[PDB]
């Protein structure tokens, strides 16, 4: 009977929901309101990229923390060396409408994807000479709003249609399916040993799952809107979500729940992209308001602004060093800021 | 090195003058979005200019106009619609006769939401109203009413400056009138002059629709250039 | 976690009245815009009425318009729907529906099949 498992389900979550009420003794905020706060961060804009022609939504650094790819409206995936300003490569789209890139740790490979439900991968290290389509994926049934390389043959991408993919490069088959969200899946972050990935969709709430095994280990519900953005701890022990209620959550997958909230009074944007320093200490979300917030992880408190957009920011990315931060907005310009 | 350094910057140059030409292609095209229901009949209006998205590319009066369509997408589009932020204009299609579910109501409220979306406060709409014949054909008839789902239909007095078509009785065009005027009452509610609102009739034989985006797409552009210039 | 539950329906004689509840919890009732909508059997779901966050902006559909009357109360984080002179036509499942974001006059996506923020609803039957 459907009422009988509508029953059986609420039993289950009230079981759930006093088991966490039992593990939760003490806040992450009173144990450590004794350490001293990490005081104002200054940070000015180092570099300015210019060249795209529309809204840029995503971006992700290379392992070296020099190479950096960005995706615009304009059909155009742009390949930068941050540290000299010049385009290394600039290849055309078949579809304008792209809404993520991923750069491969090998540096050799890149992806792309958008409202084609299309994730196609491009080979940077082509023997005749420029970047050449290598390989199309033609599985999702919804628009792509993720993707990130586990290897030069295997990636994962993250689609509309409420479900994730494990795909193989050399197949071009997917080789893993993940379901069980409810709402479009916006993005999802790769743990530090490739093992686990976290998802969050428009449904409030954010699972883990297992690469190997294909399902899902643990579901969050702490926030109140759809969840725009995902990350790791630098430690794969917590991962921090923002959402469209204008609130940052930090969640740890031992204690499966709640750890602390960042928001305040004034912000009533939602955030769109989150993510860590290479010690974890300050987290960097970018807002609706054209400005970026840099929390305190350990203390909820707003340690820095970056005001140097124009219009909303899309994307947000640390360098593997943490040498940079690189922000993209709905501008027609990239920052870099260290 | 200083060789690498030259080669680096002689490829960021080639790739700039390739953006140049590509910056001049970009800002020639005008794009277009799409937007309507399964029954409202865009397909025959696709036509009538003729995967994830569906691209259309047509020339008038040597202008480029690329259209995009929802494509294979699920009916939760509060997600992707903020894409189609920057475009020249979003065609809206209703089907006007429409006796399942009121459509006409649920067509108005996505309107609603997409003039009042926070991102779509400065893109404009070009509304379509198809199955003029139908309507016509079903009011004529009398076995569908229109008071039942809109009870002010009743009361509702047909405009002194409407144009209707030869041959076509008062009651169809007081019908289409005040389902344009429910358009209009929920486009002037807000935004009165970031983005307006620009109605239409056609029928699946219609020929005009062309030429009637064409315009409206002009009066777009001329109205944007004369609010920079604070002119109105 | 965001949760509705709806409550009052139930087996009305035509021309009667019905009180629907619906009570919220999860989420800050007062920052968003609620809606009721109902799904007939055999019929997709449709938009019926909808209360704006203070309550000064209310709307119905034409189909109920002057016999059904929604209101809010964000001290209890409640929403209430009167039902007056109900017809047959009337007997569907009636769902409570949260916009997806808060502080936003738009509101999409309300009426689409497995929205996230919608709860299970309540049969009604005239």
């Known amino acids: 009977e459907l009422d009988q498992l509508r029953q059986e389900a609420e039993q289950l979550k009230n079981q759930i929901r006093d088991a966490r009420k039992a593990c939760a003794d003490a806040t992450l905020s009173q144990i450590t309101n004794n350490i001293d706060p990490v005081g104002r961060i200054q940070m000015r804009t180092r570099r300015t990229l210019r060249g795209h022609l529309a809204k840029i939504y995503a971006m992700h650094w290379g392992t070296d923390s020099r190479l950096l790819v960005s995706a615009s409206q304009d059909g155009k995936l742009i390949i930068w060396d941050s540290y000299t300003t010049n385009k290394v490569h600039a290849i055309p789209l078949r579809s304008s409408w792209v809404m993520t890139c991923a750069y491969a740790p090998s540096g050799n490979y890149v992806a792309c994807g958008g409202l084609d439900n299309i994730c196609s991968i491009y080979n940077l290290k082509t023997r005749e000479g420029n970047v050449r389509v290598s390989r199309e994926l033609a599985g999702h049934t919804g628009y792509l709003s993720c993707c990130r390389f586990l290897d030069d043959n295997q990636i994962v991408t993250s689609s509309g249609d409420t479900t994730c993919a494990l795909w193989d490069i050399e197949t071009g088959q997917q080789t893993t399916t993940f379901t069980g969200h409810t709402g479009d899946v916006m993005s999802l972050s790769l743990a530090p040993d490739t093992r686990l990935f976290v998802s969050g969709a428009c449904d409030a709430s954010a699972k883990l799952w297992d690469v190997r095994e294909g399902m899902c280990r643990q579901t969050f519900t702490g926030h109140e809107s759809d969840i725009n953005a995902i990350c790791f701890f630098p430690n794969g022990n917590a991962f921090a979500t923002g959402s469209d209620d204008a609130t940052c959550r930090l969640f740890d997958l031992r204690a499966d729940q709640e750890l602390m909230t960042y928001s305040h009074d004034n912000i009533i944007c939602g955030i769109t992209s989150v993510s860590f320093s290479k010690s974890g200490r300050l987290l960097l979300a970018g807002y609706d308001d054209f400005n970026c917030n840099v929390w305190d992880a350990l203390k909820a408190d707003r340690a820095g602004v970056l005001a140097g957009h124009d219009n909303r920011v899309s994307c947000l990315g640390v360098t593997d060093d943490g040498m940079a931060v690189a922000t993209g907005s709905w501008d027609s310009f990239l920052k870099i800021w260290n | 090195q200083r060789n690498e350094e030259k080669a680096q910057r002689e490829a960021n140059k080639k790739i700039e003058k390739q953006l140049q030409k590509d910056k001049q292609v970009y800002r020639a095209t005008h794009r277009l979005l799409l937007l309507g229901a399964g029954e409202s009949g865009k397909n025959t209006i696709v036509k009538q200019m003729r995967s994830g998205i569906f691209e259309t590319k047509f020339q008038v009066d040597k202008v480029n106009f690329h259209m995009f369509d929802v494509g294979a997408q699920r009916d939760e589009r509060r997600k992707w619609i903020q894409c189609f932020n920057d475009v020249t204009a979003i065609i809206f299609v209703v089907a006007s006769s429409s006796n399942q579910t009121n459509r006409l109501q649920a067509a108005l409220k996505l309107f609603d939401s997409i003039w009042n979306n926070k991102w779509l406060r400065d893109t404009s709409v070009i509304l379509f109203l198809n199955k003029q014949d139908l309507l016509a054909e079903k009011v004529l008839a009398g076995k569908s009413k229109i008071e039942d789902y809109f009870p002010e239909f009743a009361r509702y007095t047909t405009p002194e400056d409407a144009t209707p078509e030869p041959g076509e009785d008062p009651r169809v065009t007081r019908a289409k009138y005040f389902i344009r005027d429910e358009f209009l009452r929920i486009s002037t509610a807000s935004g009165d002059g970031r983005h307006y609102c620009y109605p239409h009739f056609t029928c699946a034989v219609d020929t005009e629709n062309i030429r009637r985006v064409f315009n409206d797409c002009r009066d777009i552009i001329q109205r944007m250039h004369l609010r920079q210039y604070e002119l109105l | 976690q965001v949760q509705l539950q709806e409550s009052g329906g139930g087996l009305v004689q035509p021309g009667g009245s019905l009180r629907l509840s619906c009570a919220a919890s999860?989420?800050?009732?007062?920052?968003?815009?609620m809606n009721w909508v109902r799904q007939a059997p055999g019929k997709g779901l449709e938009w019926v009425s909808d209360i704006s966050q203070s309550g000064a902006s209310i709307s119905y559909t034409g189909s109920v318009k002057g016999r059904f009357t929604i209101s809010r109360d964000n001290a209890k984080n409640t929403l209430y729907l009167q039902m007056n002179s109900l017809k047959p036509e009337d007997t569907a499942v009636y769902y409570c529906?949260?916009?997806?974001?808060?502080?936003?006059?738009?509101?999409?996506?309300?009426?689409?099949?497995?929205?996230?923020?919608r709860g299970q609803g309540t049969q009604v039957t005239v």
């Open positions: 529906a949260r916009c997806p974001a808060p502080f936003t006059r738009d509101c999409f996506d309300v009426t689409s099949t497995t929205y996230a923020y």
């Open positions: 999860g989420f800050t009732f007062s920052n968003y815009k």
